[model samples]
Target chain A: TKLWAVIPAALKQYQYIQDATVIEHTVKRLSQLPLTGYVLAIGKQDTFASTLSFQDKHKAHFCNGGVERVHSVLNALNYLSQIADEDDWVLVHDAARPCVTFECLNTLVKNAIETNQSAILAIPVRDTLKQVNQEQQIDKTVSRELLWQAQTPQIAKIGILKKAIETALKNNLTITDEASALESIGESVQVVMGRSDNIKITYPDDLELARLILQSQ
Target chain B: HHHHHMTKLWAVIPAAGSGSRFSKTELKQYQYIQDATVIEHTVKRLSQLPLTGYVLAIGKQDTFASTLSFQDKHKAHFCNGGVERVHSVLNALNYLSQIADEDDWVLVHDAARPCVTFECLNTLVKNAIETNQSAILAIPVRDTLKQVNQEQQIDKTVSRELLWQAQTPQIAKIGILKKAIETALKNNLTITDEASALESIGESVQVVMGRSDNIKITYPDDLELARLILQSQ
Candidate 1:
């Protein structure tokens, strides 16, 4: 019943988060969980993760980062194959989304083990949704009912996720997240309710927002 | 014929809703946080820019809006609000129709969204005028969206491309907006924002990029964040 985490090396390139990379926060949060080890998929130019130290409870796996998010997860999975069993739980989290709470991670881990299926953290979409055409004209208003905004870490078995992602890439499907990869292969992933503050630090202003979100917690 | 091109900018704020989501006991608009109430903060942001004036639409029973005073370069008028948000904006439009021309620009902003910056307001007004089209302050969908099933399980991951969460100051012509909202009401359509009303009539609305912090205070936690944002600004 080992839990593994894969954090893609995307935040290192972000100019705003120069001094303290968000990866440290991601690793720190995952460390709270009874994780076997977490994989830090680094880019070609990245030496940032290796330099940083972690608690002795979990080992850090250094893997090559891929161009896309799905690709990066796949690269991490390849590294996990050597250390992890077929049924070992592998959770793919985003380095930018450092705000994912320990409670939410616990819920996802519990959900996966209990349901025996892939689980990912998500929040129900509260705002009214709009599907606009190319001209930026609102084509129509989409119903927000039963709609959710997907966050991380997306939890799944090591072997199951690897197969799902490989099948998706083979069919040339656009895999945005690990859940999307699983969904592409006709597998339903459980959406464990997560906190709204568990946001991906994407935009420039988001760094401040992320800091505030962390503080609020 | 000169009157055809005579266009003035008017701000319409729909402050009528009992933000039941934020608080049931206190009307969110009247609820004070920093220097003033939420509605006051919102109108203050809008009034910074040069405009004809603003019409605040409050609930019929809401007496709080009348007591508050704002020192703007423009006038502020109070009107009775309606059942829905669209109705509140519609009532404000009705009040402004007396002074505003057919093509006079009307920026309908949310009263709860107190964190709206002056830059976004300026951008909305500028782009709406420059494009000669109705425009709205909106942000592109950043998170990976998902369609959920009845069992609360994720049905599938929805495409995040070319998707946007509509925000306000939805700027449009007074007459156009009046017609759009009225048409929507007539047809009994559920319109979320002024842009949705306009979209119901096939109006070409431009989506001006806005900051995510310019959030509508829908939840309890949002009020705290809005406080920090207002203080920081």
Candidate 2:
């Protein structure tokens, strides 16, 4: 283990093996390590460790580098928070947000620890949302009165975060991310504003758009 | 022993009850959806899976299970159902126990949840393999939930935020399910869904969210939708 290296070896590992066959295995490996200054592991499924170890319920990871290959980012956070959730905060940032400046990352981590709250490095929503019904018909334009554009490196206390997810999960609830999971349990999470450069590459159009955004910045 | 992974995958389709919900109709399962009968479609879907074999929990309705032309080609060996849903499932597990490994998976499904697609099966098989824990595909309640009191009034409008409407293709470890059923039967627990019986013993069962297209044909009107859903496939 190289100590005091500015660029951690682990982050380099993160740049490689971007996902795991099963996200949980990737998660298990990460949880066994020190929580501070670790990268995220993402995948298609959310599998928790049980008494039956080393056997599969058949979740496979065989896809090549493509959209949502950032499996390490989302599920790794999920695995860690659920296993050893505590006050020691884990701020999972996405490189997709190439526009996210170092200032944003430092501010999120600093404040997340200060308030025992997680901050997602995200920008504001410039567009409006249309609320739909079961008939697949748009019923109304929901007042964005309380809605903001959600973004990356969203921070929160791990222990506080997962407890909220556990409560939601037992009740058979689903959340888009850690933030939504916490919100489902009525836990107050403060959302810190971030730059629009924290972008996710979903399609070819997105890649072109990212190039434009980066060129502008 | 050939030791096929598909063989390790066991299928249990709960066809036990008379089509009570569809009693007024000709036969809910026998009712045609696109080209195939409802139960026939259910049987075929489970059979197509890379499974070792399947068991059909049939009822006394001679017309229901006996009438299928391709019943002989179904997944597992067909076993008659017991008086109740729990009993029907228990009988199939008992039949499976005779020749299966203790850790083999027993995927118990509903005869009525006919709209189950391969898209859904991906999640069921994947989750069952990973957690090595029992799981069901379900949808979360998007509307405000209302809990009724003894008088049947709206006792309270519970938060719909956390409630999920559980559906099936419930995958369980055969050995664990058998024991859980025995424990539930001994304790006289009201076991409606297989997961509920497991829950009696504090087992952590997970639900993988699935498409609402997976509909359980419980009414006459459902036939049209079932037909519509099965049309493309």
Candidate that would win on lDDT: 1
Residue-wise lDDT of candidate 2 within A14-50, one digit each (tens)?
A: 2211232222232332233233334333222413223
Q: Model 2 over residues B1-233: C-alpha lDDT tens digits? A: 31225427888876556544446646566777767788878877776667888887777564456556654364447777877878889989999999788788888888777778786887788877776777777654432222333322222223333445567788888888988899999998767677776766766677776555576776445677566556645
**Candidate 2 error regions (>4 Å):** A1-217, B1-7, B17-26, B61-63, B71-74, B148-153
True-contact fraction per candidate equals 0.74, 0.00
What's the number of clashes in each of the models? 0, 28
lDDT of candidate 2 vs native?
0.55
Question: TM-scores of the models, in the given order?
Answer: 0.91, 0.49
Candidate 1, residue A208: CA error in Å?
2.2
Error of 2 at B98 (Å): 1.4
Q: What TM-score results for chain B in every one of the models?
A: 0.91, 0.86
For model 1, state the Cα shift of residue B51 in Å: 2.9
